[PDB]
């Protein structure tokens, strides 16, 4: 199974520099190009460069020279994109993607860069409670994107609807709703586990009646 | 730089039915067109590759034709689980460039939001904030407004609104609005109702709750 | 499509001379993608030029490649005898790898008119199916030519191939064989076949015809 | 020092499969893609696909997406196309192609140019099987006569595969002689003429014989060409 493992989030301050990577496995990362790919949030995609183990090369868009610089570590299997002197705009969601050779077949999860002056800031995850009942979690004022919301572990995967975050003073703030029958809660535990990994923050908070 | 021009933008089909997007280049680039979906929080999946190919794994109801600067991709028998966006790509030189993109949505039967309003919380409220939560889910066309009423007036400021995207099972909308005010503007009002007009009901669906409970 | 256009189709020059070969593609080629090969009779192509400016391990200087965009030139300051073969252009910077048609380097030399001959089906040839009739143009310059053929003044279309020698290696003339073929049938049914001529050296076409 | 080393001729029936190759000896193979080209006779080259040495992954031509296929075997340094559902128009010479040494860039493309071709392979497409030929005589008369010059020859018709050498007097005849190429026809068979000019005066006391060999059918043929 063909998988390529980015890098968490990353914050950084305008006119510094970021460096993610990209491990690959299931392959050999040396035998294939690696392409770099740029999706700014609700906009298209944009070809960044690649990398080509075999004969040590690279490539550039235009666009990103001076801005991207692509390199490797043929011993970890591991291919690396930093960006230097950002800005607000090269805020985005950066993909690595395997070339075949230059379309691009298997892609990376995704790593998200946000250029600002704010500093992190965890969520405050605070319980929404009242034939099928439905309970919710709010995530507010936390920084920056993104945040990941589960309930139960997982096990509660449908009847559930998690909302894209709204920006206000520098802050996100989320919402996930999860239905239910009237049986299991409150009869049963219904907890929402959320996730901020740029905080390294990981909160359950089990929600209750009144 | 070889220009990918992508269309429509956005599309509604129903189920059976069949979808058809395009993607004209400013140059010939042989038949080097690649198909991507793209579902929301995940990266693009390839569908279809250089030649026409449609990838292992994927479906028998996509597929693609064309040459030189006009392509073309189309899904037969369309689900409710084809509700994505789609990117056409051109591998054939330098810079390799995407489309615009085609956000493909479903055509369904109306349906009612199924609203639930929550009171704030003893947490917040020890913080020093409050935050009156409504549900609107599941609701179908996207169009939809939210009226909030404090003790019978409508109020409009301070509301965060945020939609998802078409669920892939029954291709239905929800909606959560945020109504966040001061603790002690929270504690001088005792109604709170949230009103979800749709064209489901000319009558609003209505779910209020009073701060004596 | 793209399309690379290769100007003049053939190029007639003598050794020592400057030889300038045009190539204009239907679309900009990006970082200067273009390619020259030769291809000497009978054998494969070789590089010449790559980038459109840079000579390839092994090639003499006085081959030179310029150009971009839209327009690129192969150019050779003094042509040596091996130099006179086919060339044609490439652009890589597409998926395509679109070639030209080719410019053929000959010897330039003065005009030759054609030496026309008919030759009539062979009695012996009867007895299969068909019947070959064979027309002669020998020893002329230009290769440029035109074979027409008539029977009863009908001019015959899709059934008569043609085949040429290459340019003579000691009077630089060319030769082409025109051969008609008809069935036993179609043969002995008609009278008159003509072999009619076009060429520079010639004022007006001539004809050869003869009948059964 | 790069060689390329292509398999031999072949000869398919219309609608059969035939598959190329071509063997990379004075480098390393992986390191270097492999392009196809074709080229009919007297017509242009024409790009097929290039194949990844390192790691297969290929790229076609639209004009024959659906029918060409390269592989490649890297153990013995060799690539491979295949190209199914011949048609007439398919015969032509078949050449692989080394790219050039990788010398930087942006695009993947700065070095895709042909940079080391081989020899060729010829692929021809008929449903005919060996065959010897049929010798006609031209016979020289009025209408083959210009001044004190007469034309006489012999037409070398329906054989396959070719060559077939043509002389006159057992090689004792060189002057004046134009042997032209081999024609194929729309029945598939090989079709030439050998035509030979000669003093007309010197007609009636001349022998003139032409002398066709034809190995691949294991025929000689001579035939005297007389004026009737
Ligand atoms: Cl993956
Ligand atoms: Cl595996
Ligand atoms: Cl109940
Ligand atoms: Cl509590
Ligand atoms: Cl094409
Ligand atoms: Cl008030
Ligand atoms: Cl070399
Ligand atoms: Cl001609
Ligand atoms: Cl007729
Ligand atoms: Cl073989
Ligand atoms: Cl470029
Ligand atoms: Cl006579
Ligand atoms: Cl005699
Ligand atoms: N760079
Ligand atoms: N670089
Ligand atoms: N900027
Ligand atoms: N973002
Ligand atoms: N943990
Ligand atoms: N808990
Ligand atoms: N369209
Ligand atoms: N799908
Ligand atoms: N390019
Ligand atoms: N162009
Ligand atoms: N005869
Ligand atoms: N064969
Ligand atoms: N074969
Ligand atoms: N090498
Ligand atoms: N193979
Ligand atoms: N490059
Ligand atoms: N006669
Ligand atoms: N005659």
């Known amino acids: 199974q063909v998988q390529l493992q980015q890098s968490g989030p990353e914050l950084v301050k305008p006119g510094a520099s970021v460096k993610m990577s990209c491990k690959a496995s299931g392959y050999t990362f040396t035998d294939y190009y690696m392409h770099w790919v740029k999706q700014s949030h609700g906009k298209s995609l944009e070809w960044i460069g690649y990398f080509y183990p075999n004969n040590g090369g690279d490539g550039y868009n235009q666009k990103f020279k001076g801005k991207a610089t692509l390199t490797i570590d043929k011993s970890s299997s591991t291919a690396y994109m930093e960006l230097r ?13 395997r070339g075949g050779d230059w379309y691009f077949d298997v892609w990376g999860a995704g790593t998200t860069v946000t250029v600002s002056s704010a500093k992190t800031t965890p969520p405050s995850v605070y319980p929404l409670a009242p034939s099928m009942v439905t309970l919710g979690c709010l995530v507010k004022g936390y920084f920056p994107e993104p945040v990941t919301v589960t309930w139960n572990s997982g096990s509660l995967s449908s009847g559930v609807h998690t909302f894209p975050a709204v920006l206000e003073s520098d802050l996100y703030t989320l919402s996930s709703s999860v239905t239910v029958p009237s049986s299991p809660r409150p009869s049963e535990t219904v907890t929402c586990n959320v996730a901020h990994p740029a905080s390294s923050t990981k909160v359950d908070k089990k929600i209750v009646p009144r | 730089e070889t220009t990918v021009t992508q269309s429509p933008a956005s599309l509604s089909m ?95 039967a109306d349906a009612a939001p199924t609203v639930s309003i929550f009171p704030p919380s003893s947490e917040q409220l020890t913080s020093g904030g409050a935050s009156v939560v409504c549900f609107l889910n599941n609701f179908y066309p996207k169009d939809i407004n939210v009226k909030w009423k404090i003790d019978g007036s409508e109020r409009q400021n301070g509301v965060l609104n945020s939609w998802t995207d078409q669920d892939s099972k029954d291709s239905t909308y929800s909606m959560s609005s945020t109504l966040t005010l001061t603790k002690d503007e929270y504690e001088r009002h005792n109604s709170y109702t949230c009103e979800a007009t749709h064209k489901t009901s000319t009558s609003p669906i209505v779910k209020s709750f009073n701060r004596n409970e | 499509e793209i399309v690379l256009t290769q100007s003049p189709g053939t190029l007639s020059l003598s050794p020592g001379e400057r030889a300038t070969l045009s190539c204009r593609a239907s679309q900009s080629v990006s970082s200067s993608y273009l390619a020259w090969y030769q291809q000497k009779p009978g054998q494969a192509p070789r590089l010449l030029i790559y980038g459109a400016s840079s000579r390839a391990t092994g090639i003499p200087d006085r081959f030179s490649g310029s150009g971009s965009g839209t327009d690129f030139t192969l150019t050779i300051s003094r042509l040596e005898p091996e130099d006179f073969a086919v060339y044609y252009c490439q652009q890589y910077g597409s998926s395509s790898y679109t070639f ?108 050869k015809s003869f009948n059964r | 020092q790069v060689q390329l080393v292509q398999s031999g001729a072949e000869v398919k029936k219309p609608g059969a499969s035939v598959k190329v190759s071509c063997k990379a000896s004075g480098y390393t193979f992986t390191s270097y893609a492999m392009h196809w080209v074709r080229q009919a006779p007297g017509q242009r080259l024409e790009w097929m696909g290039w194949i990844n040495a390192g790691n297969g992954n290929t790229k076609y031509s639209q004009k024959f997406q659906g029918r060409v296929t390269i592989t490649r075997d890297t153990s013995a340094s060799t690539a491979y196309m295949e190209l199914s559902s011949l048609r007439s128009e398919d015969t032509a010479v078949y050449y692989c192609a080394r790219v050039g040494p990788y010398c930087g860039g942006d695009s993947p493309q700065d070095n895709y140019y042909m940079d080391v071709w081989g020899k060729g392979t010829t692929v021809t497409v008929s449903s005919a099987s060996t065959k010897g030929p049929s010798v006609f005589p031209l016979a020289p008369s009025s209408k083959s006569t210009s001044g004190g010059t007469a034309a006489l020859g012999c037409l070398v018709k329906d054989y396959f595969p070719e060559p077939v050498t043509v002389s006159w007097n057992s090689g004792a005849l060189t002057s004046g002689v134009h042997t032209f190429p081999a024609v194929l026809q729309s029945s598939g068979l090989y079709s030439l003429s050998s035509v030979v000019t000669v003093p007309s005066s010197s007609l009636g006391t001349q022998t003139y014989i032409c002398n066709v060999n034809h190995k691949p059918s294991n025929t000689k043929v001579d035939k005297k060409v007389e004026p009737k």
Not at chain 2, 38 to 47: F, V
Not at chain 2, 59 to 77: H, L, M, Q, Y
Not at chain 2, 84 to 105: E, H, I, V
Not at chain 3, 146 to 158: C, M
């Open chain 3, 100 to 207: 030209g048609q080719g410019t053929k380097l000959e010897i330039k030399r003065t005009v030759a008119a054609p030496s026309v001959f008919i030759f009539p089906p062979s009695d012996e040839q009867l007895k299969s199916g068909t019947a070959s009739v064979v027309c002669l143009l020998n020893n002329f310059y230009p290769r440029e030519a035109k074979v027409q053929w008539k029977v009863d003044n009908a001019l015959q279309s899709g059934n008569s191939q043609e085949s040429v020698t290459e340019q003579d290696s000691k009077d630089s003339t060319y030769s082409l064989s025109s051969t008609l073929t008809l069935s036993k049938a179609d043969y002995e049914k008609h009278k008159v076949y003509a072999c009619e001529v076009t060429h520079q050296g010639l004022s007006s076409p001539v004809t």
């Open chain 1, 85 to 97: 002197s950002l800005t607000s705009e090269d805020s985005a969601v950066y993909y690595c993607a």
């Open chain 2, 14 to 108: 129903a189920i059976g039915e069949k979808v058809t997007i395009r993607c004209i280049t400013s140059t010939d680039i042989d038949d080097d067109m690649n198909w991507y979906q793209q579902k929301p929080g995940e990266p693009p999946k390839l569908l279809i590759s250089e030649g026409n190919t449609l990838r292992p794994g994927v479906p028998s109801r996509f597929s693609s034709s064309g040459f030189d600067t006009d392509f073309v991709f189309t899904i037969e028998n369309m689900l409710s689980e084809d509700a994505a966006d789609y990117y056409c790509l051109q591998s054939d030189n330098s810079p390799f460039t995407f489309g615009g993109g085609t956000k493909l949505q479903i055509k369904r």
